[PDB]
Each structure stands twice: as structure tokens, then as C-alpha cells.
Amino acid sequence: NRLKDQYLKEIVPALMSKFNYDSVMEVPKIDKIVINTGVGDATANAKVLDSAVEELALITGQKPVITKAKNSIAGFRLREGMPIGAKVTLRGERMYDFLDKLVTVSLPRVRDFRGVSKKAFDGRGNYTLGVREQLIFPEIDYDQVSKVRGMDVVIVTTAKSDEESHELLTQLGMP
Amino acid sequence: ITKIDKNKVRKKRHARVRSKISGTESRPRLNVFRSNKNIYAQIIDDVNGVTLASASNLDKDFGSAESKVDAASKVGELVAKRASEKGITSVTFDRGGYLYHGRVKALAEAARENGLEF
Amino acid sequence: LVPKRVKYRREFRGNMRGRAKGGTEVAFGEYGLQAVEASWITNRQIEAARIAMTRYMKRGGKVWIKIFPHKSYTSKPIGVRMGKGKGAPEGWVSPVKRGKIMFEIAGVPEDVAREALRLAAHKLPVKTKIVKR
Amino acid sequence: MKTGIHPEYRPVVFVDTSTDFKFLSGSTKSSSETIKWEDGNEYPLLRVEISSDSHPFYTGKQKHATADGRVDRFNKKYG
Amino acid sequence: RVNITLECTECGDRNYITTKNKRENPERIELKKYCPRLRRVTLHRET
Amino acid sequence: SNGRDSESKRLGAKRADGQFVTGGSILYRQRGTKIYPGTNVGRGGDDTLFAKTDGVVRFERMGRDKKKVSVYP
Amino acid sequence: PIKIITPDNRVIKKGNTILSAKETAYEIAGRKLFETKAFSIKAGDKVALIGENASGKTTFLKEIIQENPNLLCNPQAKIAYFDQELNGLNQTKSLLENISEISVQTKQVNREVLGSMHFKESDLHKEVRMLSGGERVKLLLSMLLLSDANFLILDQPTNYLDIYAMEALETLIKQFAGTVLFVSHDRTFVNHVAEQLLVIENNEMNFHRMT
RNA sequence: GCGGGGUGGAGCAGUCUGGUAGCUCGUCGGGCUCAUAACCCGAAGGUCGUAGGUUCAAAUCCUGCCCCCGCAAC
RNA sequence: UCAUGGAGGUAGAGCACUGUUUGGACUAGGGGCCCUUCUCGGGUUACCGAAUUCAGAUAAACUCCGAAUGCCAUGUACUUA
RNA sequence: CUGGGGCGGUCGCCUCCUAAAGAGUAACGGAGGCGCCCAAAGGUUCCCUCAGAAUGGAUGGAAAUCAUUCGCAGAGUGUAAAGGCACAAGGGAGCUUGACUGCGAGACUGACAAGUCGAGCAGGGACGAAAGUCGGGCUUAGUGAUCCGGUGGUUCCGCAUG
RNA sequence: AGUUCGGAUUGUAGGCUGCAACUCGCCUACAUGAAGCCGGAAUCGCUAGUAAUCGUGGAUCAGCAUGCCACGGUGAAUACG
RNA sequence: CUGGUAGUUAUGGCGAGAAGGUCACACCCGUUCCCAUCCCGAACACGGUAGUUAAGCUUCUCUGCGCCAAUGGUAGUUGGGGGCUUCCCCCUGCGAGAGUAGGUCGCUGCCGGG
Numbered sequence A: 001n002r003l004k005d006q007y008l009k010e011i012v013p014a015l016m017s018k019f020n021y022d023s024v025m026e027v028p029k030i031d032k033i034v035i036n037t038g039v040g041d042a043t044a045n046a047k048v049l050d051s052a053v054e055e056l057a058l059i060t061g062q063k064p065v066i067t068k069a070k071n072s073i074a075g076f077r078l079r080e081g082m083p084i085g086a087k088v089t090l091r092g093e094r095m096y097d098f099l100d101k102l103v104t105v106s107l108p109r110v111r112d113f114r115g116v117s118k119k120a121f122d123g124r125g126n127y128t129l130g131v132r133e134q135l136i137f138p139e140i141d142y143d144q145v146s147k148v149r150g151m152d153v154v155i156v157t158t159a160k161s162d163e164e165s166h167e168l169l170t171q172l173g174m175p
Numbered sequence B: 001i002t003k004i005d006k007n008k009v010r011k012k013r014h015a016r017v018r019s020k021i022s023g024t025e026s027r028p029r030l031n032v033f034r035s036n037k038n039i040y041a042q043i044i045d046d047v048n049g050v051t052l053a054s055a056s057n058l059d060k061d062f063g064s065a066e067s068k069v070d071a072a073s074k075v076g077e078l079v080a081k082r083a084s085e086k087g088i089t090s091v092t093f094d095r096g097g098y099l100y101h102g103r104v105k106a107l108a109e110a111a112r113e114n115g116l117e118f
Numbered sequence C: 001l002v003p004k005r006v007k008y009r010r011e012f013r014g015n016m017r018g019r020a021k022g023g024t025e026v027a028f029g030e031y032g033l034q035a036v037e038a039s040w041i042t043n044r045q046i047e048a049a050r051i052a053m054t055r056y057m058k059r060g061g062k063v064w065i066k067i068f069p070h071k072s073y074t075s076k077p078i079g080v081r082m083g084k085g086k087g088a089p090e091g092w093v094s095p096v097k098r099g100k101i102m103f104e105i106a107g108v109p110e111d112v113a114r115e116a117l118r119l120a121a122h123k124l125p126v127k128t129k130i131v132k133r
Numbered sequence D: 001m002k003t004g005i006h007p008e009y010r011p012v013v014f015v016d017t018s019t020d021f022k023f024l025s026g027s028t029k030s031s032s033e034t035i036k037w038e039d040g041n042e043y044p045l046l047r048v049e050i051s052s053d054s055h056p057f058y059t060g061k062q063k064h065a066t067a068d069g070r071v072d073r074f075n076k077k078y079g
Numbered sequence E: 001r002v003n004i005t006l007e008c009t010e011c012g013d014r015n016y017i018t019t020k021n022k023r024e025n026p027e028r029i030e031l032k033k034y035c036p037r038l039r040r041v042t043l044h045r046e047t
Numbered sequence F: 001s002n003g004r005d006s007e008s009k010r011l012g013a014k015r016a017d018g019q020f021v022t023g024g025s026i027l028y029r030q031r032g033t034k035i036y037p038g039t040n041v042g043r044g045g046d047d048t049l050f051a052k053t054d055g056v057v058r059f060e061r062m063g064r065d066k067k068k069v070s071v072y073p
Numbered sequence G: 001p002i003k004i005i006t007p008d009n010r011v012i013k014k015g016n017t018i019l020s021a022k023e024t025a026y027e028i029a030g031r032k033l034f035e036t037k038a039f040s041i042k043a044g045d046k047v048a049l050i051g052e053n054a055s056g057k058t059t060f061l062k063e064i065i066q067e068n069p070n071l072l073c074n075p076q077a078k079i080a081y082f083d084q085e086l087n088g089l090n091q092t093k094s095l096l097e098n099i100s101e102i103s104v105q106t107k108q109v110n111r112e113v114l115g116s117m118h119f120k121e122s123d124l125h126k127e128v129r130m131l132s133g134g135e136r137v138k139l140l141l142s143m144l145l146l147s148d149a150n151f152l153i154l155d156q157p158t159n160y161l162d163i164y165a166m167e168a169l170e171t172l173i174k175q176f177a178g179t180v181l182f183v184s185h186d187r188t189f190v191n192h193v194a195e196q197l198l199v200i201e202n203n204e205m206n207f208h209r210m211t
Numbered sequence H: 001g002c003g004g005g006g007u008g009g010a011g012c013a014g015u016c017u018g019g020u021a022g023c024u025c026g027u028c029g030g031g032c033u034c035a036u037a038a039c040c041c042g043a044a045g046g047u048c049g050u051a052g053g054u055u056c057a058a059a060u061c062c063u064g065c066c067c068c069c070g071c072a073a074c
Numbered sequence I: 001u002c003a004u005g006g007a008g009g010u011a012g013a014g015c016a017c018u019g020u021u022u023g024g025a026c027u028a029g030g031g032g033c034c035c036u037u038c039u040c041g042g043g044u045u046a047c048c049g050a051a052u053u054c055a056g057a058u059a060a061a062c063u064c065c066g067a068a069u070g071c072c073a074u075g076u077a078c079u080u081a
Numbered sequence J: 001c002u003g004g005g006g007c008g009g010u011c012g013c014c015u016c017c018u019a020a021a022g023a024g025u026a027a028c029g030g031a032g033g034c035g036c037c038c039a040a041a042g043g044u045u046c047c048c049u050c051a052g053a054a055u056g057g058a059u060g061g062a063a064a065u066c067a068u069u070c071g072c073a074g075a076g077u078g079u080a081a082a083g084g085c086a087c088a089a090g091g092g093a094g095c096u097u098g099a100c101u102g103c104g105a106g107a108c109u110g111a112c113a114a115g116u117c118g119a120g121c122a123g124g125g126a127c128g129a130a131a132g133u134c135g136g137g138c139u140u141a142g143u144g145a146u147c148c149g150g151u152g153g154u155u156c157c158g159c160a161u162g
Numbered sequence K: 001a002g003u004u005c006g007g008a009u010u011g012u013a014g015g016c017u018g019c020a021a022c023u024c025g026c027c028u029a030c031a032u033g034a035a036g037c038c039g040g041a042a043u044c045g046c047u048a049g050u051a052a053u054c055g056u057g058g059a060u061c062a063g064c065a066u067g068c069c070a071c072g073g074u075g076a077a078u079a080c081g
Numbered sequence L: 001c002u003g004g005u006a007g008u009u010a011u012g013g014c015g016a017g018a019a020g021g022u023c024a025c026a027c028c029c030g031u032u033c034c035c036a037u038c039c040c041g042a043a044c045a046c047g048g049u050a051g052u053u054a055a056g057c058u059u060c061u062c063u064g065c066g067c068c069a070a071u072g073g074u075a076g077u078u079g080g081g082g083g084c085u086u087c088c089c090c091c092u093g094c095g096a097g098a099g100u101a102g103g104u105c106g107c108u109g110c111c112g113g114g
Ligand SMILES: Nc1ncnc2c1ncn2[C@@H]1O[C@H](COP(=O)(O)OP(=O)(O)OP(=O)(O)O)[C@@H](O)[C@H]1O
Pocket: G028, G029, G051, G052, G053, G054, G055, G056, G057, G058, G059, G060, G084
């Protein structure tokens, strides 16, 4: 619990002495992380999920759920009910471990890593990026990846605004 | 995030329950309310709305601390007593929107054990 | 004028009883043409009246056509008996009731306006009068 | 978590082999190595290339300004 | 989609008629249904 | 082209408020629950409201946008 | 009519040595079957393989796919095998399963090839236990064509086929971009199809770039 | 309004039975010939009138429109 | 007939949905003059323009509303057959 | 049948409007559908809730999947439409076969034939702890007389008796 | 064996010539390693030191040849008619 | 007073703002057992009270949205009677919708702890 220890040790006091909260429970936390592939190629081949699911479970440490289409679309040649991509929800020890691994190891492995966009905020106080290419993570080899695809990483927060969210993520080590 | 209200979703379930259960003098409803510290419970008829009998893990009597589950059993036994006193023999169980798994099932089966019939 | 898309092609004739539901009070323009009696008014009549008003105003002013020909009518051809179905649609009409302001003008003086509305009314099967804000 | 469904996930020590930055965190990959870092526990060792401890965006980044391109080359070749 | 008699295994008596899609259900259906001769529930299979 | 209709099904009410009614009687034929079933009243497969005990019909409001019917001896 | 629709797998150069086989006497229970006199097989070759009953043919094909070093198939060859006794199917799976597992290719392409074999929509969920002697052959060949193969190898595909399917297979082997090594006791089929011949006679295997 | 049709440049299939582009003539190129034709050798040229649907996929099954040939009406 | 209680969605009215529609704001996008140019992206055009939104009209097969009458019944009322 | 007959169309069942606020109500009056399907698209028990928009986002775009917010339903309801449904009748999962046998006080409708609803009693079961629900599907179409033959079954008859 | 075949094409760096080598010379080094696994219908030279094959030289010319004209080295098959 | 539990057509709501509390309701802490998730101790479920009133929750304030809401008139209308009859007028009775004055942050009841 490297980063959880770190959190409760340093950042909560620091962050609350900055934003001047009326109590200790107004202080933001990360509720969860949500990883999602977003596969559309699975309309035409079943091997693609067979890759992506195993690959997320290796990247992440728990099985992903294959998400399905809420409605049918002909512009993508997409019938309702088809399996489209998979997702994982990381909470607790494993979201903390995922951020640890992320900033420590994998974010630097990107081609020209000069951080990531600070403007990428939903407006409500949460953050999203996307790993362009899953080989960036160490748990998976490059020699296993038939074809690269990315995945969205949502870092959800109890923060009420972009400022508090950014400071939380800056103290945790997101550039 | 706007987190949930557990009590509100619990009442949404409780309406699924109450669309098929209500209480009458011949056969009241035995409601179970559950909290994290304790359990409350009542026996009431809906035609009138007078809680005929009750019990809880907040009283001055019979207190004990067996991790709240055997306390639930005690509350069951105690409504059974206090209702067989007032003449009640038959009721319909109302799980309050909570599941019939743990503390609630324990309460229920303690009642069924003692002098109370479903 | 026509409606572009219609749900039901064929439609009952209807009534023109009662005063107009609304549109009796000239709102937008300064002057306007009020129907004193009820009648149908066709798209062709509206086009004629509009053009006459606009020519006399010589591309001046702002015109408003309040009415629209929503409803349709049929007519059976000649030499065709009664029955064997309802006829085919021929034309679009507005059932105008009494009190209704069919046309409004802003942007011109009294004389021009009154004379253009006069020129318009003669193209219409309704007895009219002219009325100000 | 269920039984049987998820893959083997265990606490593993990363080490940046650029500067020997040691760091514990959970993962699912041995890299065929084991150490007993943070005395009282065994941990596999998932060695790695550059980490946050050494990446230029987190550290100095002015490096690799080596040549202007064709110009010093011309002037170096012909004086 | 075809109509189907259902006979009892203990009796051989055709206690019921129902239907099935003959592609999605290509086999003799089996279902537990009451046999009034025996006055108990009994397994009936298609004929 | 056109010109076909179906036989009408005699929907609507069949007993009045204040009218004594014997059990099993039909009270309101309908599609869906244009009137919900109430006290001593059922709803059939085709949504018909029928009485279950001998009693006296009463039409009664539920919340604003809905109605029911009950039978009280 | 039937005709087979093949995806453009790989188009390696006509003339590339696909299999070099050096001269070697063979035996399976110790007893000699024949002596190979050495040879090579190039890409685009429609090689027939001829012999009597119990001649060594199926044995030789097993040696190929087991990669005897005396029979060096070059890399990038992508073998694909069809057996006399149809072991290449899984008798448990439905045929959409059996073919969508082994197809490297798109679902649309998988279904196009099945259509070219003239399997109806009703058939896809039938057991392999549930099929005609000809439909099983078509299953393995359709599976072989979905696999990305550049080198088909086919022990007696003429077994349970009708005239339409034999003509369509003739067309297939005769038009096939890659390379192919087939067995058939139909003189008609082998005359219609054979650009090259592998002949087993009097315990002597030989090779001929004839018909 | 009623029938046929609309598929490389022309005439015709293929549609009913969805995966399959075909026959004859022609065109382009190279040969033969002093040159053209004929003949011999190769190759190109069609998203099937069109806009939408259904289907894993449409010349093909469904719908609307636009064109041509006939027959009526006028 | 009087009283009382009820079902019911017509006339009318209304726009709270669905359609039809007028004017204004504003625009995805299409056409052009083009600057250019791997026409990539801009100057953009009132030449149009999906939609979105503000005000105002319309409706047998539209309704947030909604009568009179008529209908069902109850009563011991008051007449009458 | 028929605004003469004929051609063309129609002939039986369901849904709206006409149909005038109970019901019913015609026309060669205006619009559409049916002659099925489903072994789960049924029964129960438990669980939850949609469309669409605003942004944030890697392939990925007007629009696939994801996070947050708004959102009484602007979705879905096997299929036409009307009514109705979010305290489900809409969606998942488990267990199953009540898509049971005998019947049915009483009502609806109604020329007759027929069609419709039905609490409840008994038998023996399914689900659920239980209450209790379940005699097909949110409802309303999905169908056709007798006569004659066929199949299965039966403590029925069997032209003097067997 | 698409191979240590083949040697194109391309990148960088060199050398000569010439006032000058982008358009537009030749040559070198390194790397790249293309097409090509003996050629459709057709069609050409050759009867002896010839054909085939290997190098050499000369002219033109600062430089710029797979072209041209001469040189020798090796050295066949066949001609029924 | 507060925790449950009801009924009442939202005057009862939505939104905004303020005060308070491990007495309760909570949030929170953990997954060691039951049991759990197309993944996930978020939910459910279990075991606990270290921190907090931030939010849910209790109380209070409001008329921004919503909802209700007359009186008067107008429409339409039963019956009767007139005409000039796409329609209209008059007598009597009934009588809207819209809109407006105005109301609304709930109102009653039971049980248990304190
Ligand atoms: N594993 C084995 N063990 C023993 N004998 C074998 C084995 N495999 C094959 N044989 C024998 O080898 C001989 C030829 O075998 P194989 O079946 O390969 O012949 P073939 O020429 O392919 O025949 P066919 O075309 O009739 O199948 C036969 O006598 C056969 O019995």
C-alpha cells in the first residue's frame, strides 16, 4: 500500500491545508479507476476479444467484462447485443497498485512522454486519458500482441472540481 | 460522484415487497428494519396503522453483544413473546427491502421457532 | 404554398363555425387584413394576394402571411359516378374563420398599406376589413 | 474477487536498471527473479528499463542538443 | 413449427398436445406433466 | 385498397357505483388498466375488472392520474 | 453450380523451392515401403501423388507434416492437411465452431467459403457427428481454405463427393494460387488436375513434371 | 395507365434457387504481311440505371424514383 | 322529475407529446469566388442549410385540460301507469 | 355486393378515425395489419431501469464501447394500431414446465351457432424461507361447422349363446 | 537455395576532370538489396580457327561507351538434301 | 426531540441557502466467517466505531421552476323561439379551458429509545 500510505500520510493534510476544507471528509479521494478497450473490430472476428480480454486481465489483475451494444447501428455494421470491447473497474489496493505501476514504469515507456493533457477534464472533476498502445505496459510482451489497440483510463474522483482533481493527481504523480 | 442512498434503494425494494404484502388484524405484517448498530422490528396492521407490537436492540432489558446476529435472534424471540401475549399468532414477514440472508433470516427463524406462525 | 409532408392525404372538410380561436389581434405588423366572414382560402389566393401587396409596396415593407393551407381537398373527375372511393387530392386550403387576421404589414405608411390590402382583398372570396395595432 | 477466474496477481518489486530505483507493487509476472527486500517478506523481482525516477520529463530534459544540421557539417568539412 | 402429441412413458396414453419449432427443438420433447390415469405427475415424451 | 374494420368489443363499464353486484360479475372491460383493480376486485387476462365477493360497487381515485374500483359490503 | 471462393492468402513466388526431399528408403514397421529418389517441389506446383493400395502415400504425407529432416519444407510454407479418415475435425464441435476456431480469416469470409461449399443456414449448428460423408470433407476443405495456408496437402478428397463438387474441387486445385499435393484414385480427376506427378511403383518413388 | 426491360462498346444470359460476373462480335497491344483485312499470341474494359432497405454478404430479395421499347389514353 | 354518487374524453380550448406551419436567433453540412494546395487548412459567402432554441399559429385519425347533454345506478323523496 | 349491369376492387379476423364524451352505429368512407411466432419471448423468486444531450476522452469518424451530470420515459413493450405499463407488464440470473386434470357460483356479449372473463372447490405439482403467484405470452388478431375418413385409448354395445 | 546468384535502386562519404558535375559525367567505399529460378505468338546470325566466349588496344576525347573499328586467347555441332 | 412505520391527488415536489449530531440514522474502517459481483467487499453480506457532520438525514428560510386556485366574464351548450342559413341571432338554465387575484416548502396517525 505504497501510495495509499503516501496518500493518508502527506497529501490529505497538504491538500486540505491548501483548499481549506470545513472537515476531513470534504477532502477528495479516488473512488475508482475504470479501464476500457473500446473494441469495434469484434464485429468481424472473434479472435480480437480473445486477445484483448486476456491482455487487459494481464495488464490489470482481474478479469474484464465484455460490454455489449445498447442499440443497433448500421454505419458501423453493428447489431445490438454484439460484444463490444471490455472494461475493468479497479478499486482499493489494486487501483493504487495500478497507478503505482503506471507512473513508475509505464508512462515513461511511451514514445515521447512529455506528460499528458491537463485540460482533459470532464468538468465534474474526473480525469480520462487513453493509452494509445497496450504494449506500454510491462505485464504484456510485445511478441504476443498481434495488433495494437489503445484503451481509455478513467480516474474517477470524489472531487467537486477540476482544480481539486488536478492537485490530487499532481500530488500522486500524474504529469 | 453522487453516491447512493442505501435507504432510498432499500425503500424502492420495500415497495416491491409492499405491492404484494400488507397487514391486517387477522394477519399483520412483521417489519424488519436493519441498521449497522442494531435491528428494530414491529408488528403492525395497515387498515388501522397501529403498531401492535415491537422490539429492538436498543432497549434497557435483555442486552447482549454477540456481533448483532444473535441479537437479531433475540429480537425475533422477543417480538414472538410480546405478540403471543397480545394474542397474535399469524403474520406475514416483511424483510423491509433487505434480503432474507443473515440478521434478517435469523430474526425470522427465531420467531418461527418461538410462538409465531407464518 | 403547400405542406411538404402529410400524414394523411385525404381529410374531412370540417366546419368554420365560431369566431377565430386566435390571431384576431394584429401583433407583428402595423396594419392587417381581417376576415369578417368565414371561408376557405387556397394557396393560389394567398399567392395572388401576396404578390399584389408586394408589387404595390414595390419590394418594401415586411409582409406576414398568418394563415397556411394545411388542409387538402379532393374532387372527383367528370363522367365519374359517385362512390368507388374518395377522390384524389387536388388542392390545399386554409379554413379561415371570422375575426382572423390573414395578412399583416409593417414598414410602410397608411396610404400605401391600405391600398395594397385593398388590392389583395379582391383576390379573396372573403369579405374583409382593415385594422391597425 | 472470485476463485479461479482472475490471473495470478502477487506483490512484486520493480527495479529501474538505469539507476537501481527499487519499488514494490502488485503484478502478475516474475521476470524469473526473487529478492527479500523490505526485510520480513519474499518478493519476485520484475526488473525494468527507465522509470519515473529517471525519465527526462520528471528530471532534466535539455540533453541531446547535438548538432544544428548540415551547417556545422559544412563548416567543419571546409573550415 | 409443428403440433405434437405427448404420450406418457408409464402408460403410453396421449395426455397432451402442444407445439414446437422443429428446428430449434429437433428432438422428442420431454416434459413432466400430470397423468390423470395415475393421478400423479409423470414424464411425457413426444410421439 | 381500404374498407375493413373489426367487430367492436363492447368495452367500458357494466355496473354502476351504488349498484349491488353478485360475485363474478364483470365491472369494467378494458385494454390495459385504464382502471386499476382495487378491493375485492381482480383483473383478468384480458384486463377485465370483475368482482370477487358480493358487494356494492364504488369507483375511487388513486393518485391523480389513475383510478381504481372496489366492492364493499 | 458449385465453385469454391478462396481468400488471397499469400502469393509467394512461382518457382520458389517449397519442399526439398532427398533420396531415402522408408519403413514404418521395419518393412520397407519404397525408396525415394531425390527431388524438389516448387511453388504453384499441382503435384499429384499416385500409388496402389498400401503404397506408402498417407505415410509419406505424415512424414512431411511431422518434418522429417530428409523432407525439408522451406519456411513460410504454411502446410494444411486433409486425412483419408477425417480426423482433422473435432466430433464434439458444431461446424461454425470447428471452422471459426481454425479460421484466421474474417467471419464474412468464413461464411462466403461455406456458401461456396453450399452449406445452408440450417447446417451451421449441426454436429460433425451429424453430417454426410461429403459434408465432412467439405468442412475440412473449407477449414483448410480459411487457414492461411500456402501449401495444401490432401489425401483422397474425392471420396464422398458428387460430380458438382468434384468439378468445383478440380477448378479449385487447378486455379489455386499457392501449392498443393493431392492423392486420388480417380484417373479422371488426376488427369484433369495434375500438372506434376509423384509416382510410387515397385517400391520406387519417382517424380515427373508431366501429366 | 398496363406490359417488357436498364449487367464492359453492341446484342444476350445469369435473377426465380443470395457467396459464382459468363457467350458471340468488338476494342487495345504484340506478331504475319510491302501495308489493311483475315489468322496466331496476350491484356484491358462492367460496383449490374439510381437512392434507400434486409442479410455476415445482394446483379440476385423488398421499396421509391429516373430512363428506353411496345400497347392504351390524349 | 328532484337529490346524490359514478363511468366516459365529444364541443370548445390548449400546445404539455406527436404531426403540419410563420417569423426571428443560430448552425452541422452542400454550392460557388477563391487564397492556396499533397485543395490539407483558411477569407469566407446571408446561395442554400440538417438540426438546436425564442415568440406565435393549426389539427377527424394531437391532448396538459374539459363542459352541456345523454347513460349507469341508488333513494324512503314526488307524481304517474 | 354494386349510386343500372359489367370491368376494376371486395367477401373471414384484429386496431384506430368516422361514431355526435356509456354501449352500439352505415357507405365501393379515411388509414394500417392477420392466416404467425416463442421451449424462452412462458411460470415463479431475486436484482435494476431506459431514450437523448453536455462534455472528457487513443484506433473511432455525426453516431460503436467507457466515466460524470441532466433526464417520468422524449425508450422498450416478438408483430399493425389503440389503450396501458417505470410501487413494471420494460431488462438480466437462477430453479423449472400451471403452455396442468376435473370443473366452475356468477357475469359480459348475444337472433342462434359461437366467443369472452371468472373468484373459488378437489387432485397432484413448480418457484419461493414465507406470504403467496402460476390453468401461457401487457391486453385485444393468428382462424374455419357438420358429414366422412385415420390414429390412440376405454370396468360401453356386440342382431340365438361365446 | 532467390542462394555468398544477380546486381538495379536509394542514403552517406570520397576521388578525378574541368571556371564549373543540380538539371546533366565517370569512378570508388560502406549499407540497401530490386526484377529475374532460361523466356508467348513469332523471330535472327553462323559452314571453320567460323559461331560461342574471354580480355586488350585505337579513334573521337579535358572528362564522359554495354556503342564503333581492329587485335589475339580458347574453340565446337552440322549439312541427308 | 429523534429512529422506523403508515395514510393523504405535489398546497406535500424540484432547486437554492443556513444550523446540528458515533443518543440514534449515517458516511467511514476491514473482509476474518456466511454470502457476494457478466469484472470489482461499489452494491449485497458479515465483523467493528478510529475520524467526521462534508454529504445522506433532522430542523429552519424562500415563491426561481413546479403544483394548486377562486371571483367576474367569454366560449360551447340542453330546452324553447327566430332568421339573412359555408352560417347566425334571441330567452331561460348549465358552464368551461386559458389567464388572473391568491395559496404552497407539507398535513394527520402509530411504535421504540432518549
Ligand atoms: N503405424 C503403422 N503401423 C504399422 N503398419 C502401418 C502403419 N501405418 C501404415 N502401415 C502399413 O503400411 C502400408 C501402407 O500404409 P498407408 O496406409 O500409408 O498406405 P497408402 O499407400 O497411403 O494407402 P491408401 O491410399 O490405400 O490409404 C500398409 O500395409 C499399412 O498397413
